[PDB]
Symmetry: C11
Subunit: 184 residues, 11 copies
Amino acid sequence: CFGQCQYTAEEYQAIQKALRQRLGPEYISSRMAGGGQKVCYIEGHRVINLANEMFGYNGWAHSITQQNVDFVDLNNGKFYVGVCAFVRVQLKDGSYHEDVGYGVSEGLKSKALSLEKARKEAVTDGLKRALRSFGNALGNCILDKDYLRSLNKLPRQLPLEVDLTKAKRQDLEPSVEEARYNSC
Amino acid sequence: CFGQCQYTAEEYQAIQKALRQRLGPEYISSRMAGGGQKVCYIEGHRVINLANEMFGYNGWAHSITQQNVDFVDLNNGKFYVGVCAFVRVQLKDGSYHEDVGYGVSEGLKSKALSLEKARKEAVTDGLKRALRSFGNALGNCILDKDYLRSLNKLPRQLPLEVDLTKAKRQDLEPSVEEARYNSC
Amino acid sequence: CFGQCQYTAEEYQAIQKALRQRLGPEYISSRMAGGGQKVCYIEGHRVINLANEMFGYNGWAHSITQQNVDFVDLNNGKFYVGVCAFVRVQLKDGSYHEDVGYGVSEGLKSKALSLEKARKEAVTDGLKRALRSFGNALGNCILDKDYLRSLNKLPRQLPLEVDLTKAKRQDLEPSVEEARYNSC
Amino acid sequence: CFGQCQYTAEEYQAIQKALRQRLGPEYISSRMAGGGQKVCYIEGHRVINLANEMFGYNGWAHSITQQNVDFVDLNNGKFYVGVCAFVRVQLKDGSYHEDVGYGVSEGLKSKALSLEKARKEAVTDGLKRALRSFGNALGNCILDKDYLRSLNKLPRQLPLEVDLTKAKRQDLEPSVEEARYNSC
Amino acid sequence: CFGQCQYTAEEYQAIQKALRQRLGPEYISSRMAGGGQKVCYIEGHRVINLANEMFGYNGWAHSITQQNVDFVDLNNGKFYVGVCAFVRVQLKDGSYHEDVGYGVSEGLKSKALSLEKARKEAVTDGLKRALRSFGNALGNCILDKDYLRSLNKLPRQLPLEVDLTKAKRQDLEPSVEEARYNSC
Amino acid sequence: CFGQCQYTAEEYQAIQKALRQRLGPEYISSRMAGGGQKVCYIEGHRVINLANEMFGYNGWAHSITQQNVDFVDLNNGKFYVGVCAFVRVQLKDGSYHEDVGYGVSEGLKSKALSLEKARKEAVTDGLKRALRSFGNALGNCILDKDYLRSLNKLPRQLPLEVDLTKAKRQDLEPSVEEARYNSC
Amino acid sequence: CFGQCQYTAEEYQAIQKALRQRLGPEYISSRMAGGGQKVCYIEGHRVINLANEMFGYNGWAHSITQQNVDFVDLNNGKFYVGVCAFVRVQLKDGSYHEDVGYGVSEGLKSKALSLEKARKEAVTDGLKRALRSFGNALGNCILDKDYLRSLNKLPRQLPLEVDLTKAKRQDLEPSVEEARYNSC
Amino acid sequence: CFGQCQYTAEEYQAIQKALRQRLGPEYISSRMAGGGQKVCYIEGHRVINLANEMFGYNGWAHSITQQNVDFVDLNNGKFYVGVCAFVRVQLKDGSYHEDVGYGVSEGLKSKALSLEKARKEAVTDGLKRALRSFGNALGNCILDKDYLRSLNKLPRQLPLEVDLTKAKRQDLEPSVEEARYNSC
Amino acid sequence: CFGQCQYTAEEYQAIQKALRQRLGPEYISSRMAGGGQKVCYIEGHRVINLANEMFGYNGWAHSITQQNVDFVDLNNGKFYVGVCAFVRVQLKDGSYHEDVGYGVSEGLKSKALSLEKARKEAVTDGLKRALRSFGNALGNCILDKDYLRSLNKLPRQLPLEVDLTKAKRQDLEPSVEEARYNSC
Amino acid sequence: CFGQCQYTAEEYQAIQKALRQRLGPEYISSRMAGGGQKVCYIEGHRVINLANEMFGYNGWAHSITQQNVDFVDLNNGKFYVGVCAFVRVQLKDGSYHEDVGYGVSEGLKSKALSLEKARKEAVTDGLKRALRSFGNALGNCILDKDYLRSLNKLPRQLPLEVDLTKAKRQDLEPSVEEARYNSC
Amino acid sequence: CFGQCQYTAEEYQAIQKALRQRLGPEYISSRMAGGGQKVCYIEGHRVINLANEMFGYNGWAHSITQQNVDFVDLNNGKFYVGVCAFVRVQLKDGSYHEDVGYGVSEGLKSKALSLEKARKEAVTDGLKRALRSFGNALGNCILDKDYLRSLNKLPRQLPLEVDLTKAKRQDLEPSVEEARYNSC
């Protein structure tokens, strides 16, 4: 099962090579560092899908070891919250990597919304930082300065159109339901 | 049994493909962010059924690792409550994902009702964020901006009529009761 | 035994299909939300029997992970109590779901009665919310708005008459006592 | 042994059916709710014997997970005590249900007696509410309103005469002592 | 061994039936409830012997899960002590029942004697309440009102004369010493 | 070994019968209850030898689960101490009974001697009460009122003369040393 | 090994008989009870050798479950110390007996020497009281009043002369060293 | 699996030799020590990839044993934060090394940003320091002074151009997906 | 291994006999009890060598269960320290004995030196007291008064001259190194 | 695996001999003791490489049992920090040695930098001191005074030139990647 | 492996004999007791090498059970620190011995240096004291007064000259690398 399974030579080699790949500009994003420059990053749902593809929906897993709210300060009706979270990712073979994630909220007048924001972000930021340990294909390149420069020198493509034609429209999954029944 | 069972090739493949699917507009919903714009999300019962289909009623499970009431403030007879919950989802093979959920209640004059709302919501919010990790089909797309735009550019269909003709009207389940008896 | 046993293909398929069923109006009830509208819900004993049927008296179980009394306030001779309970339900194969239940009591002059009410309700509310995770047949539809509308558009039938003719009148159970003796 | 044993198809089916039965009026009792109406309930020793029959003296078990004394107030020489208890019932196959019980004492001048009453009641109430989870035959009907009305519409029979002719009059049990000696 | 052994069909059936018996008036006793009426109960050594017969000296066992002294008050030279104890009884097959026992001491000038009384009584009271769970022959009848009335309607027999002719007068037990030596 | 061994039919039967015996007047003793009447009890060393014979030096065991000093009060140079002990007795087959003992010291001017007396007595008291659970032969009769009356109605025999002729006079045990050597 | 080994019939019987013996006057000693009479006891080293003989240097074992210093009071330059120790003795077969021991020091001006005396005595006392549970041969008779009287009625023999001719004079042990080497 | 697998002669030898290698200037970087000289170090993503190559994405793992925020001081609107983290790296064969990492932030006005920096750096710094323990190829040379001098005496090469032509542009990985499917 | 190994008949017998021996005057020493008489004792290194011989360097072991510093008092520049230690000795077969040791320092002006002295002595004293439990050969005689008198009545021999001719002069041990290598 | 593997005669013998070697001057370094003389030591990276060679990158491991910050004092803008670490080194066969390391920082004005220095140094110091236990080749000679004198009487050689021609220049390791793949 | 392995008769006998040896003057050293006389002791690295030779680099192990800083006093700019350490030493067969070590620093003006000295010394001191338990060859003689006198009566030889010609000059160890590779 999980934690038990050992990678086969074929899967090992494939994944080992694959993880080396660098991400295209279709994955990177940016925000304006407070006072600083443009900071690139990969959106959460991206990294999640990347993983599901690299290891399969049931080939990787993560858990929150711990989340600690550093502080919740109030400066004239505005809330400044700092939160950290420790996430640990594990592959089906027992292999694992753990890292710290950090969430922040410095404006909002709502305390609830400030926490919700910091807590959720800290986790995702943790999961992402943890998966980067597996290779460039999961984000380890995002840190490489040389990598970044090579990104600007590229055609700043425009958002991809999402074709929702073959989108799931109802619950049932005959293909799946069948395979499963034959699994008993 | 659960946590033991390993996915067969057929089921694995089926589920792995299925999970890639994006959700149709029949799954999305929206609220008016306080001051913000329109926020899309998927209702809980939806995500639950999606999973019961993707993995089977007994192919997935979840538990609340911990729930912490961040605060319960009283501003002139009105209650402002913030709650967070950590939910861990596991598949029958041992695979697992865990995330934070957040519940909020900022109006109500009733303390009881304010907490009930925040505690319940934090959990459901947690379970949803947890299953998102498994793929788009369980909500990982809901975050994708490109995905969202492609949703507006679609026929805003009207609520589906629920045919309660073949609805369950009594307790007994002969089909089930039979297969079970033969299981002893 | 329990937690050990794995579902046979027959039983798995039956239950998997059965759980999809939506409940008939014979299961729903309503209360008048304080200020709000009509709130639908399924009475506890209902959800219990639904479960004993879907899984067998010994095919499901539940336990109280934890129950915490949120507050016990006294406003002019009246008690306002808020209680939460975490219930975990487990099927015979190890499968499980856990959720928060909430109990409330806002009128009563009796402290004892206010707590008894809030504690007991929190548990049952927890148990119900946990079972909902298994599918529509155990309550997951009760949340579906489309489901609800289709309920109103139905013949508001009248309470079912309970035929107590074949009701149990004494302790002994020959049919059972026999099967058991032959089980040694 | 206990927790190990699995139900045989014969015993499972028998008990499964029996538990569906509804209790006759020979099991129901009533108290006058403080201000409220008539409340129906099943006396403790009743639920005990019902279970010793449905599962055999050694087929079910319960334990007190926890008992917490909520409060012990003194209002002018009179004691108001509220106690809760969590009881877990388990069948010989590992199956289990756990619920909250509540004990109350609001009159008495003796503190000792006030606690003895609430603590013992809380336990029994817990055990009864736990067993209800198994089915109607163990009290899940007592909650059904429809069930109740049908009870009033019945011949309010008079207390049963207890024939103490074949009552146990000495310690020894030749029948048992024998089977046991042959068990070594 | 103990906790391991499973009941043989012969023993199970015999004990199951015997436990249904109701106790004769030779087992009941009475005290004058403070202000209340006559309270019937079974002395402790009685319940002990009843159990050593129903299950054999080594077929049942009990332990004190916990004992808590609720209070020790001093009202003008007199002590008022309230103690509770949780006792768990287990049969050789793993079967078990646990209950609360209560001990009370309200007059005495001696603190020591007051506690000694309450602690010992709480335990025994706990043990008796736990054994009642097995059936009428161990005290589950003592609670039945119908049972009680039938007791009054009986010849209030006089204390049994104890024949101490064949009473044990020395330590050694040849019969036993022999069987044991042959057990090595 | 101990806790493992299961009683053989021969031993089980012998001990079962033997434990039923009532103790002769050679076992009983008495003290003058402070203000009360004559209290009968069995001296510790007696109960110890009774057990060593009924079960063999290695057939039974006891441990002090816990000992709590309830209080140590000083009233004008005199110490008043109350102590309780929880003793658990176990037979070689795993069978077990646990009870509370109580030690008291109300006169002494020495604190040390007062505690020593209470702590020691509490344990012994506990051990005796625990063993009583096994049967009359181990003290369960000492409680029976009918038993007691039958004791007075007997020839108050005079102390037994102890013949120290065959008393052990040196350490070595040839008989033993031999059996042991052949045990390797 | 230890706690594993089971006594063979030969050894069991031998030890079971030998433990019944009563100690000769060569084992008893006496102190003058502060104000009280003459108190008989068995010196520590004696009980140790008795045990090493009854069971073999490796057939019995003891551990200090706990030692608690009750108090250390200072009355005008003099220290009054009370200490208790719980000792558990175990035989190679798993059999065990645990008791309390107590140590006292009431004169000394040295705090260190008072504690040293109390702590050490409490342990030895504890060990002796524990061993007493195995039989008269290990001290259970020392308590018997009838035994004591029979002791005075005996020739108060004079201290035994210790022949140190065959006393060990150097470390090595050829006999042992040999057997051991052949044990590898 | 992981922690279980043992290195084969071929892989052990290869890795053993590889780890000896010193890093080229393509790996080293520098910062201006506050007041001090030029400090060389290896950026995190570098060390990560180095490891993924030396051991394979699933041949090594790390976890945060603990992270402690040493201090968070505020000197005139500026935050001074110090954090330490303990990271433990483990190879697939059970081999392991653990070290301390330290994160620092001494300028920033934002508390949130000051912690995020320190916490994240402390972890990476820890992971790097732990990996150094495996050999020069993972950073152990970076400390060697002689090594450093030989680095300046080298052609200070210019940043490497990153060719993003064969960069990953979409989620799916056919090569992998295939190998995986054949792994079931 | 250790704790596992069981003594062979040969070794058991040899050791059992040997332990009976009494120590010659070559083992005893003396100190002048503060105010008291001459106190006899065995130096530490002696007891150690005695044990290494009786059991083999790997046949016995000891651990410090606990060491508590009772007090550290300062009376005019001088330190008075009292420390106790609990030592547990175990033989290779699982056999064990545990005792209390006590360390004292009452003169010294140095706090450090006072503690060093008492902590160290407490342990050794503990180890010695624990080994006594195995027999006279390891010190159980040192307590016997009769033994002592016989010691004075002996030729107070003069210190033994130590022949350091065949003393170990270098680290290597060819005989050992050889047997070891062949042990692989 | 690790902790499991047992050395083979060949490897044992080789390492046993090699560990005896004394380090050449190429390993020693020196600092100027505050006020004291010249202190010799071995740089961290040296010991690490020495161990990777003696045991193999996967033949030894270490962990930080605990790290405690002793003090952080501030004397006029300067920080004096003392820290200790307990490191435990383990060889692949289970063999292990543990020691204390100590880190110090006494000048710096920065608190962060002072701690980082002390925490890091304590661990490295710990690791070095722990590895010394394995023999001279890992630093045990560094203590030997005689060894040190012989070092001064030697040609104080000049720093070794590091040839970075065959230095690792890219991530991939073909030799390794190959062997690994064949390991699946 | 370690803790598992059992000594072979050859190795046992060899070590058992060699441990008896007394150390030559080449192992002893001395310090001038503050006010006291000349104190003999064995230097740390000596004991370490002695052990590596008696047991093999992987035949013995040690750990620090606990280290407690007794005090850190400041008397006019000078620090007086007292520290203790408990060290447990274990042989590959499971055998073990634990002891207390003590570290002291009474002059220094630096707090850091005072602690570093004491903490380090306490551990080494503990380690030596623990190893002594194995026999004279590991230092148990260093205590013997007769042994010491015999040392003075010997030629106070001069420091041994350390021949660093065959000293290790580079990391690699061909002999070992070979045996290891063939071990896979």
